[PDB]
Each structure stands twice: as C-alpha cells, then as structure tokens.
Design a protein around this ligand. Structure first.
Ligand SMILES: [Mg+2]
Ligand SMILES: [Mg+2]
Ligand SMILES: [Mg+2]
Ligand SMILES: [Mg+2]
Ligand SMILES: [Mg+2]
Ligand SMILES: [Mg+2]
Ligand SMILES: [Mg+2]
Ligand SMILES: [Mg+2]
Ligand SMILES: [Mg+2]
Ligand SMILES: [Mg+2]
Ligand SMILES: [Mg+2]
Ligand SMILES: [Mg+2]
Ligand SMILES: [Mg+2]
Ligand SMILES: [Mg+2]
Ligand SMILES: [Mg+2]
Ligand SMILES: [Mg+2]
Ligand SMILES: [Mg+2]
Ligand SMILES: [Mg+2]
Lengths: 116, 206, 178
RNA sequence: CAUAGCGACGUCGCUUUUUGAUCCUUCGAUGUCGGCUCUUCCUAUCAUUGUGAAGCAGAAUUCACCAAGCGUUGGAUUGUU
RNA sequence: CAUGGUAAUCCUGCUCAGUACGAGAGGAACCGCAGGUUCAGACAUUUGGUGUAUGUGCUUGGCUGAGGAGCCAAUGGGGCGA
RNA sequence: AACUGCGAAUGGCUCAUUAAAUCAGUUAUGGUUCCUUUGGUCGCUCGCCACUUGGAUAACUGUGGUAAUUCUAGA
RNA sequence: CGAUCGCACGCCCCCCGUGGCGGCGACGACCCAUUCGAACGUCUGCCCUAUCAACUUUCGAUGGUAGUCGCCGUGCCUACCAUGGUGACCACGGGUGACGGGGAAUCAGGGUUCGAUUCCGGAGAGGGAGCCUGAGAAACGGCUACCACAUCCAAGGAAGGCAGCA
RNA sequence: CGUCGCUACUACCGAUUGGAUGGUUUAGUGAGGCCCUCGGAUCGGCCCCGCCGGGGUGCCCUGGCGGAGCGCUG
C-alpha cells in the first residue's frame, strides 16, 4: 500500500517485489522481476518487446465541429443600447441615409456657392 | 555544420594546413536533396542574400522538349533508367541533372497527329475512332490540305523513336537541377546520344 | 489545490480553494482542453460542464499543450508556441514546462465553463462585466449593428463616456480605420 | 618508604610445551617435518562476569583472587616450527 | 520421566553527560533505548543461485524432396524460466 | 504602454591561435552575392466588396502559480 | 503585377446636384544600374632548425568524367577512372619569448635589432562544438549542448561569461 | 703533470616495465543542433440541415439554439 512503482514493463510493482537499480549518473530504476532487468541491462527498447505496456500503447492494442458566439455589452453601450441600435431595419436606416444625404446636400450647395 | 571550406584540404605538396579560424557560415553546406519520384513535395530553404532555393524531394511531372521538331510539353516521369554518376541512383530512382529517365509520350504523340496528320504510336489503327477519325480526315479545303501534304514529306521519325512511341515511353535526360530549382526540366534523347545511351542500357542488363 | 474557474460568457473569474481528494478526483487522468462535467465538487456545481484550460505546478511551472506526460520536461521553445516570449527576434530558449494530463501535483487549475446549468453561482455567473472597448474597423461595426452599406457609420460608433472627479465631462470616440 | 610495584647476594621448589643424559620397549617396519581440517582437554587468565590492592582524582595502566563458560582474527615473506 | 546431552556470546551507538572527578587538559558509571559480531536452530514470502519441467523463444552444421513439423551433434550453443 | 519597422554583424578590448597560413603590393570575378543611398521600372499581362475584405493578437480589465528571473497561464 | 500614411486645397458641371478630375510629399516594391562592401581566386615576398631527407595517397592525395552542395569557379563532397602531386632552388616535420603590414631605435655607406600598441587587414570572446533571426553572425553585452570554474535556492529549481568602461 | 684523500658546485649514466604537466590522435560511448521519413495534443472552414425561419413566391433571401456530416479538409 506504499507509494507504488512501475517498471521497464510498466507493470505495477507491489511492495516487497522486484529490485531497484541506481546508476552512477544519478538515475534510479525499478524492475518487477529478473526478466525485466535482464531486458533493461541488455539495453533492449521495451517498445519492441511484445508484452510490455509501451508496446501495447504504441501499437494501440486493446483500446466534431463547434462554433458558438454570444452577445455582451460594451462599456459605453449596454445590451439594450446595442440591440436597439441594431434594430432599425424597417426602413429607419434608409431614413438616416436620406437625412444625412440631404444635410450633406445643403452643406455641398453652401460649399459650391462659397467656392466659385 | 557541413563545411565547403578549402582550408581543411591538404596543400599541393601534401603538407597539413592549420586553420586560422573556425567554421564560417558562408562556407556552409546542406544535405543532398535526393530527389525521388512520386507526388510533388517541394521544400523552400533560405539561402545567402535571403533568396529562395527550391528543394525537390519528390517529383513526377517535368517539362521536356522534343527539340528536333521544337515541341515542348509537360509530361510525366515514369522512372530512372541510366545514371552516369552513380549506379546506385537508378536503383533508388533519383532525379539528378544528368540521369536519363523514361517518360510518358502522350503529349508528343498528340502534337504529332495534330500537326503532321499521320498516325503515330499505333499498331493497326481503328482503336480511338471518335477522335482519330476526325483528326485524320477533317474534310478540309484545298489550302489546308496543301499545307498538310507538303508537311507530309518531312514527316520522318527515326526508327528508334518510332519503336519508343510503339512502347509508349520515351527515355529522356533531365537538364535542370532539382534541389536547386525544384523542377525537373530536360530534353528528349535523339541522334548519336540516343543509341549511345541505348547501348549503355543494353550493356548494364542483357 | 487552487481552482481558477472562469466562465467566458460573463467573465468574473474567481479563485476557488478545495481540499478534498474525493471531490477533485474527477479531473485526474484528463488532458487539457477536455470538457468534463464538474458535478463532483458539491451540489452547487450540478449541471455544469467545465473545460480544463491548463494550470501550474507546485513550483509555478505552467502547463503546455501536446506534451502528453505527467511531470516536467525541457523544450527548446521557439517563437509563438506558449510559455515563452523572446527578448529579441529569433531567440529560442530551453524552458521547463508541465505536461498536459493533470494529476495531484498542481497548485492552480485554470478552468473554463462550457455550458450553463440550472442555477446561478454567486460572484461567478451574475454581475455581467462588459467588454471594455468596441470594434474599431468599419466592417467590424457594420456587422455588429447589421449595417448594409455606408449607413450613418459615423453615428453608429461606440462613444465612451468617462467621468472622474477633476474631469470636466467628455465622451470618447475612436479613430475608425479602413 | 624493604615488601604499591620490583628483589641483589643467597636459598627451597614445581612442570615436562625446550635442549640434554640414558638405551628399558620396538630393526620377520608403530609411515619421519610442516601446513590443512576437526574434536576434546589443562590453567601457569590475554579478553569478557564478580571481586581485593596501588605511587587507584577521572581516564588509562599494574598486582592479586574465585574462575577455562565463551572467544582469542584477516594478510605480505618463508617448506618452515 | 530414570538417565544421557545442553548454548548462547561479545561489542558499538544514543541518553545518562562535557556530568561526577580534575587547577586544567581531559573524562567515566548504574538504569533505559537502538542495533550489531561470533555461534546455534530453522525457513523460502521476498532477493540471489541452480535449472534436463529437456518448459518456451532464438540459433549453427547436418538429416527427413520442400512447407509445416521435427530430430542428431555423449545436455549442440545460447535468452528467459515454474 | 505596446504592436510594427529599423538598429544591435558598427564601435571598443586583446594578440592565444596562425610560418604561403594571416598580411603587403598587383591583377580577376567574362565564376558570385549585396541592407541602405541614388537613378531607372511600377495601366506594357486581355484575364452581389473594389467607395477598401477576413481573422487573430498586443497594449488594457480581471483571476492567479512560483522562493526566485527581463517566467508566465487561464479568461 | 501597391486593399498604405500626411499636407495645403482647388476644377468640371452639359449628363445636371453627386459624382468625375486633379498639386507637394511619405512608405512601398519583382527586376536593372550604382554605392558600401564581402568571399574565393592570380603573380611575387616571411624567422630558426637536417641531432627534421624524403613527404602526400585505404580515411582525396594529383588529375579526368558525371553529378551533389554551396551565392558562385573548384575534390567542396560522392561515384567511376588514371597514378599521380611536392622535394638539397630545402619539400615534409618541429620551434617561435610569431598576429601581418604601414612603421620604431641605432645611423658614413651597407646593415642589425624592435613592431602587444591608437591606421589597414586577420582572429577570439573561459575551451571546443552546433544553430535561429537577418542583406550581412557560426554573433557570444543572441540561443543549445558538453567540459572547467562559479551564483541563489525553500534543495523541487533557476541563473552565468569585464581579451568593453571603471 | 697526473692518481689518491677532504669539502663545495655543475651537468651525465642509471634498475625503478619511475613520476608530473601539455599537445596531437586510433577506437568505443556519445549530449545537442540541422535535414529527411513519420507522428498528430489541439485550433479553424465546407458538408450545416433535428428546426423554427421563408421571398423572388411543399419551392429558404437567412437573421439563432441545436444535434453532429461522424465525411471533405487546412
Ligand atoms: Mg488607415
Ligand atoms: Mg630510598
Ligand atoms: Mg645396560
Ligand atoms: Mg604396518
Ligand atoms: Mg599405526
Ligand atoms: Mg589459577
Ligand atoms: Mg559448550
Ligand atoms: Mg538447424
Ligand atoms: Mg522449416
Ligand atoms: Mg542418426
Ligand atoms: Mg560421435
Ligand atoms: Mg538463469
Ligand atoms: Mg532588412
Ligand atoms: Mg604567441
Ligand atoms: Mg602590431
Ligand atoms: Mg585593428
Ligand atoms: Mg567572432
Ligand atoms: Mg560564439
């Protein structure tokens, strides 16, 4: 029930089982039995050993579109403010278009009179 | 990295040259492109001056020119046949600046019936009637027929190119440098070069 | 085990301290950017789906996408991956980061709530803070107010009123571009 | 300050792990050194138990008593003891 | 149970304690605790060794027409092994 | 403040290495590249946005982790 | 084969009345030329040493042919061939208390020594090696690794380069 | 003038398969970078289409939830 260990093979090493190998370069390893340690000390890659966990995972043995937008208020323009300013579609936008056009029209005529 | 220096070589007299500096960048090298045959895969590398070199990793289509009739068409590379540099490049199917390669001959044949109005690459005919018939007859007027029949006199193809058209394949030599331009242009063999290379290919096998 | 819950549709992220292994075991052996229903950590969180967006370690090392491990490894981080901004152009540095699968040894777990459930979380799902400042491109405001064609675009700008003590009142409007 | 510890000149003993002296047994043969291994025995006790004495302050050391239960090692050189 | 045999031994560290004692330098002990040496009697959970289960892979030469399956080389060699 | 561009390949220090190597003079690149400056070239191509298109990210607001750094993450 | 940024502002109005025209720049560019260069080249020139006389060539040494690679010319590298290339006119090897030159000292003339040193060229950033960006770096007051020193640490990490001025 | 005897200093030979520090290398191991062949943790687009919607008139101009087409793709 101690802190568990996993081996060369990746198997759980229950307490009181196997051996622990510490190399001179500061690395520690633990093995479940002498087969795992004889594979490790032979410098065999456990990915090419059929019964090891790494081989099982590397060969995968055993085992949509989303887009959402939301509306938020802006400092200076609340939700009601923006939703009102985006809902002049029954011809009111064309009213603003024409009224700006005519205002710019007297501006244009005043410029045309004071230019020539 | 890979150095293209000249100070790591021995002197002419055989003496050992001591370097007076470490490896500079402008004398660098890069691993060989080793162009293969397959679907197009071209890599862009940055070179000195910020310019662009195109590495051809795999190529399959190449603009080859007939030359004798001045017909240049973009055809498909089939496979490498002979390579004067290394014998091992024909095994690995590598496109280099001088290896001669078999290509598909359909554009040249198409141009030949479209311009010369004589069958080519066929055995006995009557096999592709809806197109070969209309391009063979054409029901043309006196002037166009006067053009075609005076172009008939020089409608002579060397027996080797006739045989290769019957085989449907042309063996042609690359002229560009894939891995420097990223394309595999070249020209079609004919003349003394053609039988020279054919004798070489016959010598290497059978 | 700190929890940085953050629900983007309203903002108002808050830090949460929970200390029970049973309640937060539902997160273990899950990659980041994986959406897990956070109903385990109390009744108030029922009906909620949360997304793991990353976190930090005991030593403060952040978590990076794609590492696929539980532990700390060193990566030669170039420009624009994560967890690294170059002091000068083209600079790459070897930095230590945390793998994407989450385990016990984390300090804070940054989280994103994907979908809303049945009731409101006090201080999280209420008091909607607004995004500060609106769009600056012409088409980016035309879309936002459904403008068709050059309809009074000057007067659909998001004018920003500001008020301080010594400030004589004044509204702020941005230089629209394009 | 003879006798804590030593003891000159003399003198009385014990032991047979030294070397002798002798020639009683063995010359119709008792296999002759050392080492290895293994058991047991003696105490004239090196260490350990309990003690007495000191020129025994502590520490260490020394003399003596009951005492042989247990222990008394690993190596270089040498056939060696 | 008559009788015969018999077996445990020794050391270190901590605390006592920089204490008693001693001018100082130096420097114990009793109880207690933790472990060891030598010896003895066992035992195989684990670690190691063996390994002809001639158990299972690999492999040399050869033999069965080949594949498959095998076998011989006085235990063919070798890995792992109940 | 930050994004973007540019600069940081200059200057300064030292003389360990280096004996046809560095270097000096001469000659060539018709065997190469070249930021910037300056001068040419920029309707030479027939082929439901052009009255100007899309997306993200800074700076910024907020929540933090680490003991620490010119470290950074989530929103 | 420009979806760029400022400055003064003007002209046409028939078609009309909202469009169409325009001046000074700034940024930008594929390419060409120029400038700044840079790199490899050509010829000629260097101290001491034979108690250094024969070197080079399997692992390129000299050359040819075809390629690879490099910004390009080339054994720069590969493949296939030939057997070459340099030496008493000092090759090759070793030493240098050698960075090279312009120059300094001494001064009949000829020379002999000294040039780390402010100008030109080269190299290096503790030793090596390897790279990203960029036109230009094998850059180090840029990065990666190792080696040697060495900083902090809560021991999990993190951070180094004064042969720049002091 | 030389041997011998004494005292100094200087080198030399010398068993010790002597010792130390530099430099160049064979061989083995070999970090890291670069290139290629793979790899795909994630991030977007199309096919969305369970639908309310629809206008030139069950035939969508599409203004949102939403399944996911369980594919095409970058
Ligand atoms: Mg603008
Ligand atoms: Mg006296
Ligand atoms: Mg007698
Ligand atoms: Mg006898
Ligand atoms: Mg006898
Ligand atoms: Mg006695
Ligand atoms: Mg006994
Ligand atoms: Mg066999
Ligand atoms: Mg068989
Ligand atoms: Mg037989
Ligand atoms: Mg036999
Ligand atoms: Mg075994
Ligand atoms: Mg630039
Ligand atoms: Mg020197
Ligand atoms: Mg000088
Ligand atoms: Mg200089
Ligand atoms: Mg340098
Ligand atoms: Mg450097």
């Amino acid at each position: 029930m101690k802190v568990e260990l996993c081996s060369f093979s990746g198997y759980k090493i229950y307490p009181g089982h196997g051996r622990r190998y510490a190399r001179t370069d500061g690395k520690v390893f633990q093995f479940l039995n002498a087969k795992c340690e004889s594979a490790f000390l032979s410098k065999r890659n456990p990915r090419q050993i059929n019964w090891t966990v790494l081989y099982r995972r590397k060969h995968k043995k055993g085992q949509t579109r989303r887009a959402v937008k939301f509306q938020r208020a802006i400092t200076g323009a609340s939700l009601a403010d923006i939703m009102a300013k985006r809902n002049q579609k029954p011809e009111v936008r064309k009213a603003q278009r024409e009224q700006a056009i005519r205002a710019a029209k007297e501006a244009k005529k005043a410029k045309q009179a004071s230019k020539k | 990295g890979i150095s293209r220096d000249n100070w790591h070589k021995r002197r002419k007299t055989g003496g050992k040259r001591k370097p007076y500096h470490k490896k500079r960048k402008y004398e660098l090298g890069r691993p060989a492109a080793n162009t293969k045959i397959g679907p197009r895969r071209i890599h862009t590398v940055r070179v000195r001056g910020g310019n662009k070199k195109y590495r051809a990793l795999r190529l399959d289509v190449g603009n080859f020119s007939w030359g004798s009739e001045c017909c240049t068409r973009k055809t498909r590379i089939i496979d490498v046949v002979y390579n004067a540099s290394n014998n091992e490049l024909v095994r690995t199917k590598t496109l280099v600046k001088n290896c001669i390669v078999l290509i598909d001959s359909t554009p040249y044949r198409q141009w030949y019936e479209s311009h010369y109005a004589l069958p080519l690459g066929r055995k006995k005919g009557a096999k592709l009637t809806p197109e070969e018939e209309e391009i063979l007859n054409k029901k043309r007027s006196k002037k166009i027929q006067k053009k075609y029949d005076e172009r008939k006199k020089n409608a002579k193809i060397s027996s080797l190119l006739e045989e290769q058209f019957q085989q449907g394949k042309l063996l042609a030599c690359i002229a560009s440098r894939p891995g420097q331009c990223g394309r595999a242009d070249g020209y079609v063999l004919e003349g003394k070069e053609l039988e020279f290379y054919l004798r070489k290919i016959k010598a290497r096998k059978g | 085990m700190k929890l940085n819950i953050s629900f983007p549709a309203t903002g108002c992220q808050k830090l949460i301290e929970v200390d029970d292994e049973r309640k937060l075991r539902t997160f273990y052996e899950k990659r980041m950017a994986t959406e897990v229903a956070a109903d385990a950590l109390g009744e108030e969180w029922k009906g909620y789906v949360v997304r793991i967006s990353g976190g930090n370690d005991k030593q403060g090392f952040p978590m990076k996408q794609g590492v696929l491990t539980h532990g700390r490894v060193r990566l030669l981080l170039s420009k624009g991956h994560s967890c690294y901004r170059p002091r000068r152009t083209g600079e790459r540095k070897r930095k230590s980061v945390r793998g994407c699968i989450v385990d016990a040894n984390l300090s804070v777990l940054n989280l994103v709530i994907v979908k809303k459930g049945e009731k409101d979380i006090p201080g999280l799902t209420d008091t909607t803070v607004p995004r500060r400042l609106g769009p600056k491109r012409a088409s980016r405001i035309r879309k936002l107010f459904n403008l068709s064609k050059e309809d009074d675009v000057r007067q659909y700008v998001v004018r920003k009123p500001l008020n301080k003590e010594g400030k004589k009142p004044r509204t702020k409007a941005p230089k629209i571009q394009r």
